[PDB]
RNA sequence: AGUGAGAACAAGAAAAACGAGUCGAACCUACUUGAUCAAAAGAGUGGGGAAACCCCGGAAUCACAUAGACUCACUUGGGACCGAGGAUUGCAAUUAUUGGUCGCGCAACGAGGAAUGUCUCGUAGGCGCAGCUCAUCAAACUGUGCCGAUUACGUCCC
RNA sequence: CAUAGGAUAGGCAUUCGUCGAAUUCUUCUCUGCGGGAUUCCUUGU
């Protein structure tokens, strides 16, 4: 951006047990991390007051502080409730948004929710088979 | 167990439009269009089972029907299309239709 | 020497200049002026479901409804769902053939609501959209800046 | 003046100009001071079927079509006039339509 | 007031001419203000060497469904590639690619007319294959490379007219003339 | 490989300012391969070196931006 | 007991529409509200008025 | 991600029923609203039996000196897979009907072996749009326009 | 005479839910029948 590399620029930034390559841009390393995306790392960047010319090894230690709180709490920062991942999460009722290493995690527990009770759902899963109304004869191929 | 944030006994308590409050878009609108439609039968000989003593097994063809916290604990034998799948309605198969639990077909294995 | 008159011709309007001149001076007067009432959706949201990413300009709604201000000088009368055509998009399904997207009418409605309350935009005697007086003498004077190279 | 319009529409083009300027050559003897005859576009109607009634061979379609002609008279007569036009027993499948404007 | 076009008002058709007279009739440098014509130079055999040299380089990149019909495209792609060559050269661009074109196709070639016999190639064919070698290979050059398509256009049009072999045409120009001198 | 920086160093950008006004036919690609820089910081540096005057701009479009000397 | 023809007494479906001809209930041309079956219009295009021209 | 210019073919509501021999409602639609705040909706109010309303039919390719982001990477290419809200069609959505929102994207795929199909000018290719199937659903087919070439104008080799 | 600002026509300046009045028109539009193309003309096979 006709300006000067900084001396503690890091390519490899470490945020929310991820590392994100920080000779990207802002926003499009910042969805690096699980359960960021495009469309949210621009509401991160948004909320934290970072200009998004900007590369993301660039970002200072009180700066990535500030960013993973936003996406570990983001109804703090009046991000709507309709733009999070987790809105009504059975067996707690609570809207949430989840992080990298949660992601999978709870992944696994509706995988397994649906495996406990014999739903349908659960039982394609066990199976490895097609979980959706597609067909599966000409196209799985695994 | 817990089912969006409640035991079975607030479960049990909570009105008919609270409980369509609670639960997901497809069986809310289940319920909406069951608002004055004359309730299956099914409701009603599940209980008429529950109050002896796992009680006995009602049968049944209703798939399309969302479990609600009075239909848990009954067994309910569901009709996959030739024969009777004997199923106990756990607590956490609330809000999912009848037609979850039994499958209309085998798994294929070459 | 490029600008002066042509031969006889003294004034301009719109379609006398470029397009895109006349809407990025548009958007750079409302911002400096102030009196916009831009929402705080704005913010938020998409133009569109058909586009697929926020609209990445911090200046957006100040384009559009300068936009939307040079598309109720051509056509009066039309309604939020005329300019949803004028804005819409060819969106990307992922596997299946693209197919053209109609904008969300509901920025639409908040660029027409901005610009009644500035003023220059009335609601039209029986279809949608209509310029007011003063919005003729807004986007003409502002047509004869860019042509002379005043844009701020 | 009352300001009718018959509707001339036909099926056939043959029979559309027959009734058309039959219609017309009786309203010039009364001096009516119509508005000429102006042909409304011909809308044509398409089904494309195949041919099969089978399901094999090459799949080959054939398009039908049907065209309906149409024309519209404006005559300021007065409405028991207009009647007097209109009166004759004209060819099998022409409809005309008497309408006052305003 | 009939103002004789340039190209894109900028670069003249007045002093173009062939070091190759054998291909003269078949290099055109009729004058055109825009590439882009719209004629039909296809309905006859030979019309279509008629037709003016820069808009055939335009015609010969609207190639491989990503461009098929992307005429007013290639336009704009050509415009910055003329003025590119302008600036390697220093010369008239127009006379750059007249010169590339002379020299970019095989005079000899070998098929079997009955063996592999060397046959003659027509100077019709020889301004076909110049066009089609040059937008080929500059198109391949930047299909996945930091270049420009305008750059790497104009670095194809500037080493055949040079006659160098480090561009496309000239290293299949050269393959072709001594495979048909082995296969006489 | 083809690893290009992201930023100018101080080293580099000196490059810029010194070499680039030298070159005839200056493009933000031709920046990108010869100082190994990304072409959205030659862009931008060459962008830097016309409002000081130090190259031209021959030729512009929205993508394509095809810059020269200045020969005074 | 009178459940006798209930499905077919609600006529949302491809089978409440039939041939107006030739009683049938598959692939029937419904483009102008015309309701006759595919094999059944091609003996009848030409009283209907239809006529192949191209 | 913006912004501009801007097509043609077309479709469109109902019965010896239920309502006020005449008229309504079923169909498509503009426009307002919803809106002191996401889409998707949901509502009013007009109009149209269709050259009369949609409609100055604001299609998409394209275009742009947009002084816009990316810069050669399996990457802001690609969008398969599936997780969680939500809303509409239906008498019924489970073996997601469909749309929309945020996730996932670490799913191959970097231009394709032997083979193989179609095509000679407004054509191939690209691009969308209507109609038809249709309560709800087009990667289909029947049509239509838009952008618009390479090559040959030959031969009996297969 | 854009922050850096190129290329490109020029008797009575121009623009139009402005939901104006008038008063003359068929250039484009629609379309029932009809013209027009025939190797017709020209100079090698
Ligand atoms: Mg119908
Ligand atoms: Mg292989």
Same mark, same amino acid.
């Given at each position: ?45 948004? +909320? ?9 090894? !660039?970002?200072?230690? @009180?700066? #990535? &502080?500030?960013?993973?709180? /936003? ?22 009722? +609570? ?9 999978? !995690?709870?992944?696994? @527990?509706? #995988? &397994?929710?649906?495996?406990? /009770? ?25 | ?110 | ?152 | ?102 | ?184 | ?72 | ?54």
């Amino acid at each position: 951006s006709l300006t000067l590399i900084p001396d503690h620029f890091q390519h490899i930034v470490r945020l929310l047990n991820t590392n994100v390559e920080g000779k990207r841009k802002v926003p499009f390393a910042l969805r690096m991390v699980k359960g960021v995306g495009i469309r949210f790392a621009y509401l991160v960047c948004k +909320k934290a007051g970072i200009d998004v010319e900007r590369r993301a090894g !660039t970002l200072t230690a @009180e700066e #990535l &502080e500030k960013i993973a709180e /936003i996406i570990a709490d983001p109804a703090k920062f009046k991000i709507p409730d309709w733009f999070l991942n987790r809105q009504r999460d059975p067996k707690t009722g +609570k809207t949430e948004h989840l992080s990298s290493s949660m992601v999978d !995690t709870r992944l696994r @527990e509706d #995988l &397994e929710r649906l495996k406990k /009770i014999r739903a349908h759902r659960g039982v394609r899963h066990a199976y490895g088979l097609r979980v959706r109304g597609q067909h599966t004869c000409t196209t799985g191929r695994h | 167990f817990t089912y969006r944030g409640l035991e079975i006994d607030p479960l049990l308590a909570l009105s008919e439009e609270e409980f369509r409050a609670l639960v997901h878009a497809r069986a809310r609108r289940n319920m909406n269009r069951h608002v004055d439609r004359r309730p299956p039968v099914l409701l009603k000989r599940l209980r008429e089972a529950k109050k002896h003593v796992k009680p006995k097994a009602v049968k049944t063809h209703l798939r399309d029907v969302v479990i609600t916290p009075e239909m848990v604990g009954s067994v309910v034998a569901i009709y996959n299309g030739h024969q009777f799948n004997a199923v106990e309605i756990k607590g956490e198969m609330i809000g999912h239709y009848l037609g979850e639990f039994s499958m209309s077909y085998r798994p294929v294995l070459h | 020497n490029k600008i002066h008159r042509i031969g006889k011709r003294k004034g301009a309007s719109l379609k006398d200049v470029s397009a895109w001149r006349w809407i990025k001076t548009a958007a750079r007067h409302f911002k400096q002026e102030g009196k916009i009432f831009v929402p705080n959706c704005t913010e938020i949201m998409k133009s569109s479901h058909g586009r697929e990413r926020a609209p990445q300009n911090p200046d957006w709604y100040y384009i559009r409804c300068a936009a939307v201000l040079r598309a109720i000088y051509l056509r009066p009368g039309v309604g939020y769902g005329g300019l949803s055509k004028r804005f819409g998009n060819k969106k990307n399904y992922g596997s299946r053939p693209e197919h053209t997207v109609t904008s969300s009418t509901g920025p639409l409605h908040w660029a027409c609501k901005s610009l009644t309350k500035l003023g220059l935009v009335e609601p039209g005697a029986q279809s949608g959209q209509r310029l007011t007086r003063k919005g003729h003498k807004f986007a003409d004077s502002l047509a004869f800046q860019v042509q002379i190279r005043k844009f701020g | 003046g009352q300001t009718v319009r018959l509707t001339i529409t036909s099926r056939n083009a043959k029979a559309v100009e027959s009734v058309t300027s039959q219609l017309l050559m009786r309203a010039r003897d009364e001096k009516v001071t119509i508005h000429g005859p102006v042909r409304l576009p011909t809308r044509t109607l398409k089904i494309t079927t195949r041919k099969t009634p089978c399901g094999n061979g090459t799949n080959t379609w054939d398009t039908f079509e049907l065209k309906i002609y149409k024309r519209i008279i404006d005559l300021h007569a007065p409405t028991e006039q207009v009647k007097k036009i209109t009166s004759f027993t004209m060819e099998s499948g022409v409809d005309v339509s008497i309408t006052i404007l305003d | 007031s009939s103002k004789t076009p340039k190209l894109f008002n900028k670069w003249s058709f007045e002093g173009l001419e062939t070091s190759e007279l054998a291909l003269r009739d078949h290099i055109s440098t009729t004058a055109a203000y825009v590439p882009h014509t719209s004629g039909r130079w296809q309905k006859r055999r030979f019309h279509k060497a008629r037709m003016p040299i820069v808009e055939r380089l335009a015609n010969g990149l609207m190639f491989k469904g990503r461009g098929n019909g992307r005429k007013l495209q290639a336009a704009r792609l050509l415009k910055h590639t003329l003025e590119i060559i302008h600036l390697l050269t220093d010369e008239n661009p127009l006379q750059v690619v007249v010169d590339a074109v002379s020299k970019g196709a095989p005079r000899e070639d070998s098929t079997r007319v009955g063996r592999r016999q060397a046959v003659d190639v027509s100077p019709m064919r020889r301004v076909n294959e110049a066009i089609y070698q040059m937008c080929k290979g500059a198109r391949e050059a930047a299909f996945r490379n930091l270049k420009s398509m305008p750059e790497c256009l104009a670095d194809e049009i500037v080493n055949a007219s040079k006659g160098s072999s480090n561009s496309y045409a000239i290293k299949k120009k050269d393959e072709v003339e001594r495979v048909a001198k082995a296969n006489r | 490989a083809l690893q290009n920086a992201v930023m100018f160093d101080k080293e580099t950008y000196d490059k810029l300012r010194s070499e680039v006004p030298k070159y005839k036919l200056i493009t933000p690609s031709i920046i990108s391969d010869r100082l190994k820089i990304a072409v959205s910081i030659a862009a931008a540096g060459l962008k830097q070196l016309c409002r000081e005057k130090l190259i031209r701009l021959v030729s512009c479009s929205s993508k394509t931006r095809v810059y020269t000397r200045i020969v005074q | 007991l009178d459940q006798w023809r209930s499905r077919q007494k609600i006529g949302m479906g491809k089978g409440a529409r039939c041939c107006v001809i030739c009683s049938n209930q598959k692939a029937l041309i419904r483009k102008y509200e015309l309701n006759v079956c595919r094999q059944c219009f091609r003996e009848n295009a030409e009283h209907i008025g239809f006529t192949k021209l191209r």
